[PDB]
Amino acid sequence: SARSLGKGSAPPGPVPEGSIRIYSMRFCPFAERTRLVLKAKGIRHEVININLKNKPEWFFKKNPFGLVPVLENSQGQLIYESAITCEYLDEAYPGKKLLPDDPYEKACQKMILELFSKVPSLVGSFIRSKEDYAGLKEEFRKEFTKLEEVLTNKKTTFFGGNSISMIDYLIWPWFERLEAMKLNECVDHTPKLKLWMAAMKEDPTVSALLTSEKDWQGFLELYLQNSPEACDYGL
Amino acid sequence: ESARSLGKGSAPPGPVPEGSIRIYSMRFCPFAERTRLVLKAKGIRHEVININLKNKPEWFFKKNPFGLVPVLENSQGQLIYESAITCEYLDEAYPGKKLLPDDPYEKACQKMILELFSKVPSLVGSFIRKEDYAGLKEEFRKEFTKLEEVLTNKKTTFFGGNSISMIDYLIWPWFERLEAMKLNECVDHTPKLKLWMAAMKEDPTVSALLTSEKDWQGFLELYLQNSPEACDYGL
């Protein structure tokens, strides 16, 4: 049931009443954002994994950009872009809100997300390709000092207060891979950010969705080998 | 004159008065025009401080760590930057008619359409910055086709329905500069987008904030030569 769907696969059926579907990939950190929100809010859903190296022909009608995550509900409505999917889920579902309702506090979370914007591309660059490592670790350190400054100025344990909120879940997938990439020395000069990473791993939602560093390395070696079995590593 | 832009050696501004809000802007900046369209549409009491973008004051780098306009500042000293964030903050923080739909899926559609528009501001910048023209005009036609497909599927005059909403004000500044840049032919294959442009010019908020073709070309001639008088052209 978790095996990814690829080129030649049959278009999926309609999403059943009272449920939502996520088009995802088990090792995609952008989709992990949406799955953290789905788990934190206790939302009943179904997962369809997409083979990103051998995409189903029907997947391009779900998203014109051809990227995961994509949400699909029973009315056939489609929502793409990880940040948009997270905001939509917090708005359309009941229970405790992950986004603060104060307009300024909500704007701060979106400004912090923009301060984090260079981190996903650095992770991408690090994974790919070596003599480049030194320069890239320096780049990581500079970006992390910007997040250290936010926590210093806020005087809180998390990026949106003394308890976890949307902003923490949005940036967590990249800090999760940091240790798997053996780049933990990049937070050795950011003590508040380091304490934040330890607090995040103790969160029940974060903890339930962690990928083991061996499963991630299994995926990565298959991905770097350009294998169409990468998305399905560990079955 | 309160409108002349502030440069190096200017005194840092005083506190924002109670009941008001300040926008740090530049009269020919399309990103800050988004924010000004929202302040005008919602009838928000505010003050404008223009920044000399070719002679930036030192005190301004404390208002935004990116050093860009627009920036909002209130009486509590709160600072909000990134044009899309400033617009959403104003819609939530102030009374009157909401520019954003209340439905979570309709709100998500507005943010997805904004993403479909994302290449247009950088093509405008590349065009203003040959022979390059033919290629750049073809890129404009491809991007404008994407917007025409949205209007074709919605069967409405505007991007969020039968009435003007936030998404229209967010993309309008770049369509406003088409005639000025002599790029009207780039929409001659997009009839619905062409009717939308005419409908936008009829809107009282849009009409009140239009820049004359002469003031714009007058600004551009000075800005391209790094003139410190560029931002204050037309007085």
Residue numbers in the entry:
A (entry chain B): 5 to 133, 136 to 241
B (entry chain A): 4 to 132, 136 to 241
The publication says:
Among them, the omega GSTs (GSTO) belong to an atypical cytosolic class. GSTOs have a cysteine residue at the catalytic site in place of the characteristic tyrosine or serine. Consequently, instead of glutathione conjugation, GSTOs catalyse thioltransferase reactions similar to glutaredoxins.
The GSTO1–C1-31 structure was determined to 1.94 Å resolution with two molecules in the asymmetric unit. All three inhibitors bind primarily to the hydrophobic or electrophile binding site (H-site)5 of GSTO1, but do so in unique ways.
